[model samples]
Target: TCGGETCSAAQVCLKGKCVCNEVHCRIRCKYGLKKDENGCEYPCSCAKA
Candidate 1:
């Protein structure tokens, strides 16, 4: 009787109703930090020897 993510196993959340695993609904996020250097295996140092 509500709408949110899902009701059951791959189920659906309709307008105040629940359905079987009919609609293939899913959510995912690929999160990661991108390197500042463009594919640089090694970084450069700006210090004097």
Candidate 2:
């Protein structure tokens, strides 16, 4: 985890920060790759699977 926050298996630390890799995405959001959180990249209105 980054900075003590627990991250998922798909996540990893990058320079003391959490970031998501291409494979980490289950699905892209409406604004694909425009935003990210919890090591996932996607804008608002995201999907699972």
Candidate 3:
């Protein structure tokens, strides 16, 4: 489980696990972006998979 009261950027609590959600975005792209997944292609990135 997440040990902190607040999570750091790129992270979210999921089933007590702190999962990363790519917080870095040189050029933010809406719609096409989402949590780390297999179907995602290049030009898109995630802090963790």
lDDT, each prediction: 0.35, 0.55, 0.50
Candidate 3 regions with alpha-carbon error over 4 angstroms: 1-6, 22-49
Off by over 4 Å in 2: 24-49
TM-score of 3: 0.31
Q: Please report the candidate that would top lDDT against the real structure.
A: 2
Residue 44 in candidate 1, Cα distance off native in Å:
52
Itemize residue pairs with steric clashes in candidate 1.
none
Pairs of residues at least 3 apart in sequence or in different chains that clash in candidate 3: none
Give one digit per residue, the lDDT tens place, for model 3 in 1-49.
4765464455677777666654445645545454434332333453342
- Tens digits of per-residue lDDT for model 1, 1-49: 3454435433446666555433222332254222222222122222221
lDDT of 2 by residue, 1-49 (tens): 5887765654677887666655545554664543344646533345443
Off by over 4 Å in 1: 1-6, 23-49
Sorting all predicted structures by TM-score, with the top scorer first, yields 2, 3, 1
Pairing residues by index, what is the TM-score of model 2? 0.38
Displacement of the residue 46 alpha carbon in candidate 3, Å = 12
